[PDB]
Design a protein around this ligand. Structure first.
Ligand code: 2PG
Ligand code: 2PG
Ligand code: 2PG
Ligand code: 2PG
Lengths: 258, 256, 258, 256
């Protein structure tokens, strides 16, 4: 079985300190769960918040420098998201995996900018996109030179201010890329979020079969500057990870062949 | 209480077919003692899209064939009703009376079912939000029902498509035992066999009280739900798989 | 141009008196709007309420007798809905148009029970049904002997507790039956309702093109026993009808040919 | 203020095509003096599903061709931007800067557009509820924009389908002028020409401040939105139709 990916970290780079605190914990779990490839995630810019008054971040320069500290202090791989083509090059200096936001999954130039860096690229599936329509997204990355591609399931528009997770997307997308399940954005209520469903839905994802999971986690979610109602309390991370590795193991012999 | 597996051919195509399927379910029944098996088949497909499609052989012949399965194999029975008058005659043989998803809000049908003293399983309508099943349960309690089940079978997602919102499992559990219907949840109304097993794995990882699966020795030849009925020979493997997943996952099912 | 249909009346037969009061007003409008075919509607049983504690009605016998009074006192056509096959025969004694509830639009026996009465049949399109899938519904009625058939647009499931009206359904369904737009149920919030959208959406319906409209109306909606937030104040009916006849007239030369 | 009609070929396939279309719009412009016509064409289809599809001839060539239309015919101009840097160069020719629907929440793009001093039209995202456009308008006001439009273009309805919820027209009007996009609202993402005219009739019966329509002398030969671009010759008839409907219906538009 392939090394399972767990992408995790605070939603936003609130400070270099917050980063070091989560990083410390992620490093501890990586030493325990040696069958997992851990990737530390945090955004240097929440460029698509609903409100002009909401927290965005401290800028690209500061964020890359704080992620670089996490990588240097803990030896952890790094992923962060870009919003315009010009950011691909500077971010690629620290990011092992460049993330493409869900609203931007069809922006050709942004995808090509990420792909020519030589870094892996993970595209969040747009809330508007059918799972079979990710085939062209992967084709655009492969055309642009990307050799390691991920597609992340994060819910689909289901009426107003609600997302539903159609688990059929996991085996469908697996036909053309590795698949990541985003356990924290899939339960958000666009323009909101329900923490009580994070755990059940992530159990469903590993029972269906995916190649990794993505989770935002913060020492104190209620105090977070972004995604306060969906970020997972840091102390709860180890137990969630153990549970998914257990459920994955027992379901794995039944995963179907693409 | 023990995990429920409700299984059988979609339609009572013949007393014979029920006996063949009944035999295999009897067999699995002896192999998996911790599971409560309930044999299912419909005496009438009362809501087919086309007037030219197979409906069945009538309630009399159907109850007779189901009686034969219960007598011959000792299996509990479940079938669905479509109008209030059918509840009492079906209750002579059915341990569980099933309410069709389009009929989940028909007050008299629910009350007629509750009045028989039998257990009632209501398929959640494709139009119903999970929190709105609380009133469904309340109707049945008011009607005297004491063993109540709610079955997840997908929700309307645009035209000719259903999506399973797994958040409904924990929500519905606040007021009834919850069953996951593995075969209708992937059908395309007005489906895809390849998604049956993956989604049933999800349902037990999330946590449910039972699973519902239509099965037929030769699905391609079935007269109803031909595209989604599970081949009978695959049933054992899927049941063992979900008992294994449940065993591990149950440690994590959230309290009520 | 065909005589436009306006189906209207109180949601439920709260009393024979309420019926006579609305009937009086509908009769007055029928004398004014002679280009409209008016049909008086009221249910003898709200058989599918969400709550066991909600108002259902005073029974079939009482309801048919109250509708028969309206027909006899005002000379108005009558429509009411059935819920089980056995009710088709007694209701057909008074109802010119037998209505099939939206949740029951695929119940074969109920449709055949209505069709063999020789009365017109109007089927509410299920909130789960695609517009092209009404073709088989009409085929079932024609097979059962119905010679005058209507399909009513009343919204489609759009996430939880919300309905959306896809106006493309009007020209699609028109391929096989006369089409009615239900102005009051289309704005209800299943398991709720928004009165402010009734008027705009009914203007859209006649600009697209339909063969009639359906509206629930009560002298005092807030006091209604069913659909209190969507029933139209009776005093507002005349002005709505004048507006739709005006918009219909001006749009009509552009209605496309089926 | 007067009713807006924004029209033109989806993509700047060539300075020529724009001139042919510009000529017809100039003509209608003289025929319908109460209407403010705005000529539209995209210099880059930056979000095509396939890497092998037509994107265009670049921003430079595009701004040049649009400048030619404004110089030659005196028509106001609108085109869309895809990244913040494009706002200032596009603002030399565009009276209205268009924000793509997938990019309606990208704060910097909205701010870059507002900073040019031009009017801004934001296509409402297929994922956005109508009440959630209030924050979109607030971003643009904060950015200095004073003439703001919100365009209805359909909402995600299951997979590969959009539905127009007309309730959004009156809701969005509380905070901006509202335009109805008649051609993308009926496209099937990842459409149907037969529904364009019926839905545009609905939009003016409900009440909007303008309509948006892509038009091409020969849609079948277009390099983008070939399935939905309106044949140029049909444009006059549809504009006269909607002015007639609006004239009658406007008596009933609800206050703000
Ligand atoms: O993970 C996040 O921080 C965001 C941005 O990429 O994800 P999404 O676009 O899926 O909301
Ligand atoms: O299980 C079935 O036979 C049918 C009828 O009860 O189910 P549903 O109503 O969910 O289609
Ligand atoms: O008009 C009504 O009173 C009801 C019942 O027929 O309609 P619907 O089923 O469309 O909710
Ligand atoms: O009108 C268009 O050219 C496109 C781009 O702005 O529209 P939308 O983003 O609505 O697809």
């Amino acid at each position: 079985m392939e090394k399972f990916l767990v992408i995790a970290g605070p939603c936003a780079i609130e400070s270099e300190e917050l980063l070091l605190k989560v990083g410390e914990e992620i490093k501890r779990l990586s030493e325990k769960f040696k069958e997992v490839e851990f990737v530390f995630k945090s955004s240097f810019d929440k460029a698509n918040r609903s409100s002009i008054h909401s927290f965005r971040g401290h800028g690209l320069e500061y964020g890359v420098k704080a992620l670089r500290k996490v990588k240097e202090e803990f030896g952890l791989k790094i992923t962060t998201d870009i919003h315009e083509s010009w950011q691909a090059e500077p971010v690629a200096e620290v990011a092992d995996i460049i993330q493409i936001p869900a609203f931007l999954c069809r922006q050709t130039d942004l995808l090509l900018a990420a792909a020519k860096t030589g870094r892996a690229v993970n595209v969040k599936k747009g809330q508007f996109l059918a799972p079979w329509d990710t085939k062209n997204v992967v084709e655009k990355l492969k055309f642009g030179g990307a050799k390691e591609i991920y597609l992340t399931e994060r819910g689909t528009t289901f009426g107003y201010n609600n997302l539903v997770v159609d688990f059929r997307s996991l085996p469908i997308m697996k036909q053309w890329a590795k698949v990541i399940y985003d356990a924290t954005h899939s339960v958000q209520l666009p323009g909101g979020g329900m923490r009580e469903f994070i755990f059940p839905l992530i159990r469903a994802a590993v029972a269906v079969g995916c190649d990794g999971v993505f989770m935002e986690t913060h020492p104190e979610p209620e105090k977070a500057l972004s995604d306060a109602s969906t970020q997972l309390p840091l102390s709860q991370l180890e137990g969630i990870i153990e549970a998914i590795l257990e459920i994955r193991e027992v379901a794995s012999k039944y995963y179907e062949t693409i």
